[PDB]
Amino acid sequence: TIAFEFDGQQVEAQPGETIWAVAKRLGTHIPHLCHKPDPGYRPDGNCRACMVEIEGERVLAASCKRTPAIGMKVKSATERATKARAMVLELLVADQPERATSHDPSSHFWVQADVLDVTESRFPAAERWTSDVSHPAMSVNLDACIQCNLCVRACREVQVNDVIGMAYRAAGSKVVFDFDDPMGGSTCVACGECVQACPTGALMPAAYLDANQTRTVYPDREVKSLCPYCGVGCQVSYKVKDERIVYAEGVNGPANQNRLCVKGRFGFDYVHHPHRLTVPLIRLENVPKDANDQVDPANPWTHFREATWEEALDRAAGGLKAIRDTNGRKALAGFGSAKGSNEEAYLFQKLVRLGFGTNNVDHCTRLCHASSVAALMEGLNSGAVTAPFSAALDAEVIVVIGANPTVNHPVAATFLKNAVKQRGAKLIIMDPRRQTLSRHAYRHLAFRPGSDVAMLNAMLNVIVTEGLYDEQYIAGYTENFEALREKIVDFTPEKMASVCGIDAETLREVARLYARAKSSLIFWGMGVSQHVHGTDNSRCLIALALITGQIGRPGTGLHPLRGQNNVQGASDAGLIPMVYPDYQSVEKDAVRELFEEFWGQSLDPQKGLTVVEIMRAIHAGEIRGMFVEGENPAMSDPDLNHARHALAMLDHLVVQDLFLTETAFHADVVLPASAFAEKAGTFTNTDRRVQIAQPVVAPPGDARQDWWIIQELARRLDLDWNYGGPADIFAEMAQVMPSLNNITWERLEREGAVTYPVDAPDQPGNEIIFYAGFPTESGRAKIVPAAIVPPDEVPDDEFPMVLSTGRVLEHWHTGSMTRRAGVLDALEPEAVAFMAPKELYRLGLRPGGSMRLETRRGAVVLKVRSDRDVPIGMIFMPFCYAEAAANLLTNPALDPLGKIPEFKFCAARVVPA
Amino acid sequence: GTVRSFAHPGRGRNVARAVPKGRQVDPHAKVEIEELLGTRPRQRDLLIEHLHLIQDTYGQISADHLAALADEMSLAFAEVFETATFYAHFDVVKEGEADIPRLTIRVCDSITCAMFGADELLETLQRELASDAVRVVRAPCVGLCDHAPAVEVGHNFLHRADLASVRAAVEAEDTHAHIPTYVDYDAYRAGGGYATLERLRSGELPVDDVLKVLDDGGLRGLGGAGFPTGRKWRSVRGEPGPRLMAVNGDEGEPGTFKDQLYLNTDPHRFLEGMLIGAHVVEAADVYIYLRDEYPISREILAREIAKLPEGGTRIHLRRGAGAYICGEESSLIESLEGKRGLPRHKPPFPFQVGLFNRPTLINNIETLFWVRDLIERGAEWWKSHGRNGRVGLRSYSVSGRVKEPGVKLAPAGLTIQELIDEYCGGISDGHSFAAYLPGGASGGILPASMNDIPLDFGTLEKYGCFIGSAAVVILSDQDDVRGAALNLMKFFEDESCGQCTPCRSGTQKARMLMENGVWDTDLLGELAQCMRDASICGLGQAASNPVSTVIKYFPDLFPE
Ligand SMILES: Nc1nc2c(c(=O)[nH]1)N[C@H]1C(S)=C(S)[C@@H](COP(=O)(O)OP(=O)(O)OC[C@H]3O[C@@H](n4cnc5c(=O)[nH]c(N)nc54)[C@H](O)[C@@H]3O)O[C@H]1N2
Ligand SMILES: Nc1nc2c(c(=O)[nH]1)N[C@H]1C(S)=C(S)[C@@H](COP(=O)(O)OP(=O)(O)OC[C@H]3O[C@@H](n4cnc5c(=O)[nH]c(N)nc54)[C@H](O)[C@@H]3O)O[C@H]1N2
Ligand SMILES: Cc1cc2nc3c(=O)[nH]c(=O)nc-3n(C[C@H](O)[C@H](O)[C@H](O)COP(=O)(O)O)c2cc1C
Ligand code: SF4
Ligand code: SF4
Ligand code: SF4
Ligand code: SF4
Ligand code: FES
Ligand code: FES
Ligand SMILES: [W+6]
16 A cells, blocks of 8 residues: 555545545545546546645646555645646636527536536637537437547447547547547447537437437436346346436446446337337237238237227137147247246246146247357356456457457457457457457458358367467366367368468467467357257367467457346246256156156156257147247248248137237237347346346336236136246246345345356355366267368359348347337337449349349349448348348258258349339 | 339438448549559558648648558558648548648748747738738748747758748749858868778778767757767667667747758768768668658758769768757667658657667767868867856857857856857847846756856756756847747647647647636646656657746746
8 A cells, every 4th residue: 555645634545546536535526627537537637627736746646546655745735736727617618608698507527517616718719610410319418518529438448349539639629420420320330329428418319408408308217127138147227207217327237337328228119119019919819820920010900909908818828728728738838038037937937837738838038049058068068158258358369250249249349359459369250250359460361151061170280280278177077089189180270271261371370379378268159050950069168279279368268149138037037948957957757857856747758859940830720839938030030921921821820029029920819028128037147147127117008027918828727827927936936946045035136146156155156167077977078070061051053142140239020029119229220231342243233222032942123232241242132121031031941960051151132122 | 123122211321432441542632642652662650751742842741642552551541631731731621622832921920030020921922922822821930040030931041040031932933942052072171071981991900999089078868858879879789680770850849940051061070970870870761750840851861972983881861840849869760761750659669669679779969060170080079168157068059139140169167247248249239138048948048147057967956947958049128938839838738749648738728827817836836747747758848948937037027
């Protein structure tokens, strides 16, 4: 500690602590404008409002910037310092617009001016720049700017989106976007970090201002909850006025530390959309079911009639029970939700396995990471991530393969960019497409689509042959390395360079760089897993991690990113066909008998069918009744023509949703449920973080809680359930989920988030796992070599283009939620596809023109966007557009082990339209 | 078929984007910049040099070329744009904007040239010669005050310019710098030059003997601050290596023109002192930062540097783009690293954390110019000069209402009366000594009644003044003292880097307060104290000196 004297008193200062921080901790508040005491914001010391006097120095010092030293004497109450601070505030007030009609009359600046008794300036005003309202989500009014640079720090050092700069000189210094372009037409991604940082109201949410850029809307209350979209798991503070969410701010959660993306900050609007279901619906007993059926959500009376809750629940449960008691127990199935809470998932799987009496329960994880999970279970006997994404800060080398984190996990990507900028981490990106992140990458490998195994095998060959592996780790914590050493012989970089499209020298350099680093961390996403050979790719990644020993230490491990906000928690609750809760196999007699005693009812011992197998069985007439909750297979399933045929072939389909989705078109009964912001429960993020959600607003009309609806269905299926709410369900689940040991509803409410596994009710959990071995029979991980397998469908003269599908920043999956959010809708209004400019020239197209996209399975028409990140010979398209549904064209062929379709590669043809 | 569609209200905005967000790099622009760069590196610290290459090739920096440059260097658009817009000589032209005329004329409007009618001259040239191919703009002091008024035509500076001579240069296409005759590499070596440096490299002359001669000699920093040079060379040596060196040739204080005189007459005398200091502190590379307004000096140094033998130190020559604040040592470091010239906070100090965060030695051109003489003639020779109790030799840049303006190499500690009468030929006829500026723009304004004050480092601080770079401007009865103060404030208002409130806003409010006919000297008094006490760097801390001294020492100009 650095002991010194402050204002005539003897005090002691912790290391790395400024004078301002010491004074604040001791109660003496010093005014500040450009300093923001929050994580990630380095003090700049430019506004000069925090000046103090240091004995033995000619001029005054900025307290927010200076750290104390032994023997120093600091005085803040002197007439010199107070006069200087007052004059700085008066100079700034001279240029401010009139407070009562300003863009934020209660800004931090005005509060500081109130503290210093400065309300008017003796100095004349200067006319500044005009308003900029080009961006729909945020408003720029730089006539109230004080040039503190907090927005510059927010964009460039915290988020590292690199949009804002401070351009000119002297009093003409100006906040600019790109080349001083309008915000709406710039590279801005609308993360909103600058808005949250700005202390004057120069930058504001557009929803707070009227047409004259005044009078910030004033919320009645603020509620702390989570983001409903992706697996990063940001904590959010929702602002409510007149029982409506109007704006959202980031909260200092362990995952995000006050950071958000556009969907978290501005995408809350869907809960208030007029298409929200308010009453139960029952299909009219006149309208047949068809694959090409269409229902207007604004006018559903063409196909449906409204019903009471009792009548609709009776119809749904009666249809299911009649099918069960006439056609047998194997004629039923259920699709759960990865967007609901852990309690709802537990109740859903319990309902299927007890009321339906079968193991046919599954959700979107079958389409997400099934092959990766299969490889990881074969190798390590576990499917969990081995490190959080925050471990990237401790990693010398970071590998991102088949993932686009600046689009699909933006906050985690900000932490990766922090690692690169502040700690010198070397980032290697392996992806056929260039990305926004590529400019920061030490190397970007742009291999040909579908050829991951060749490149990874070449890297393994380099490591094995040149003797760069960890012999000590291999002999002691792995097995079967001799088989890999024998197999890897035929995968030299020279042979594989033509197959993968990456030169041999680059492959050798990357392999050496990964092996020789002190700590390396691998992230991977859908580009690796969504192939018929995705398990092979995951095996290659696992072997790379195992032979070099880069696992089980800080800054190391394997992190396959979790997509949905609660895919991990739903998997943990047993919402998958092959295991009970906590990944206990339904085939073992011991597990089955334990659950038969716990639930007090005999259980089916056979493994269930997966999502695609279920759709096949529906198409064949084996499955007759289906219950779907929180999923939209009519847009997310592959080969939508046959999938919609199968859905329309059902005898009885019950749908529990927020809107009349494309799946609900074929339903017999539709039950209106509650959105994320209206419910309580627990959700588990990509880092094994269990976090608690709180209701922000009430459900509209007569909509009901998801858990209540499932309880009603169970009670009508001859089950005696009486749950008070989510907390009781949590207690019951914790009785049979050892991974929840020392985690309780009370502790969760008190703390907000706990990482599992955790060994005590007062200690934090283990972020890093596998430090002492693996949960296998022998405790050692098994290396499984991989071989080259071609894609199921490859281009020919008939269909010469490679079609790949994915995501855009502003939209979620099927578009059911994000297209109903006004800001997100405005940002991406129309269906588009991406292609390289040279390909547009060769095909005879123009940017923004229409084209017809065709495969062997379907045809669509949409607009084309020219993109230089797309390789020659590829067309990339999101599946979020109902007017041109990408899954009308995709290949339903499956990975033999993972049972995942090949969304990422098929053959297509393009023609002008 | 199967329109399907979507009931979502986006159909109103349903026009999408034909391209990703933001402006897009033109394939044609990328090829042109790539050939323009050739084999040059793409490190960040070369950004300003690359900006110079585009501006010189095309006469402007179009948004197309600028965007191509950022992609080449892996920088963001706002990164290159914010850097280019900082400097006054870079013209960024966005889409749909008017092009820059082929020829640019700059008329100095600083204090000395204004006394000789620069304000009317600029108005005449704008009315007479401005066209679609000629642009006429104001400029700050270009270090030609002894030849006022000064006008630049392309790269050709005209002494005592007028309408006829400026029009002659344009018609004759005389738009290039005129290189004079100077002492070259061979004549320098025939005069015993570089012999002292050779002894240092071999080891016959110990490094400890160089520092002892400097410390005993009392050589002080001629860039203005006056810090002892020997003590500064020791401090950089004490830090762990590797170490770097940078020469400050950004001579921008209005009224200072001594550095230009020595570069254009005896360049190798400067180059030897620079090389000796680089050996003393064991610096592998030496960066020379020369102001844009000295094209003659830039050409002279380039040829002479190419004539040196294959030594153990590599010399880098860098070029400014117009910024007075870049003379501040930390701001010069940021410019050399390729960024906006914003001064850094202290501590730490540049001699500990400097260029590329290494221990760095910064010296003025004139300070290094005298190093060879001080060793070969001894410290005793240096100290033999001096008057009124002061010790040393000084070069005063004297301009204004004197008969013989120029650089006077005179003993330190002279008074203004002694300097004017014994070296400047006295006040010019039809004028009477009224006031003087001892330290250029930032040193304050004093009445002629105070003509008995010795001018040296530390002697002017009693009256709220300082000698600075010894830029002496002489004013007569036909010279509004309050008009001179407004000129200096207008200079500081434009030259402020804009980082901190007291300087960025204080200079603007002070200028507006002085343009009213009756100054609120009480409000200006309070504002001056805030700028002195709270400004980050020396520019803001001294910008209120002209206002403060005029109020204090000219009471007859302010009615109650
Ligand atoms: N904005 C937004 N964010 C989301 C979602 C969303 O819908 N919208 N969904 C969430 C969900 S559920 C998930 S699973 C995650 C998915 O997150 P990501 O894994 O980032 O999803 P994709 O964009 O499909 O990733 C595919 C990437 O792999 C590349 N690629 C294509 N072919 C190949 C190949 O053969 N090999 C390799 N190695 N790469 C290839 C693609 O060009 C692209 O860069 O995102 C989550 N986050
Ligand atoms: N071509 C192609 N196809 C893909 C993929 C791809 O990359 N390319 N990715 C695959 C992957 S990784 C995934 S995860 C799947 C995703 O496929 P889905 O999970 O079907 O996609 P969503 O649009 O999220 O599904 C409907 C959404 O409506 C909302 N919702 C519906 N009912 C309720 C309810 O009762 N309560 C609440 N609170 N919300 C409700 C939720 O947001 C719910 O997830 O798509 C897969 N399909
Ligand atoms: C606003 C400002 C402008 C300056 N301009 C110059 C300059 O043009 N030339 C110069 O040599 N030093 C200039 N200096 C001083 C430098 O910061 C630095 O102290 C000097 O180069 C050291 O010279 P020395 O090594 O001879 O002492 C300036 C300082 C300030 C605060
Ligand atoms: S919203 Fe985010 S990306 Fe846009 S300017 Fe602000 S910080 Fe940068
Ligand atoms: S816009 Fe706001 S945060 Fe940015 S410089 Fe101006 S006042 Fe500061
Ligand atoms: S990064 Fe993911 S969790 Fe965080 S705000 Fe964005 S969508 Fe929500
Ligand atoms: S005093 Fe002026 S020049 Fe110095 S840092 Fe502050 S604004 Fe920039
Ligand atoms: S708050 Fe310390 S200088 Fe702005
Ligand atoms: S040259 Fe015009 S004032 Fe120095
Ligand atoms: W997914």
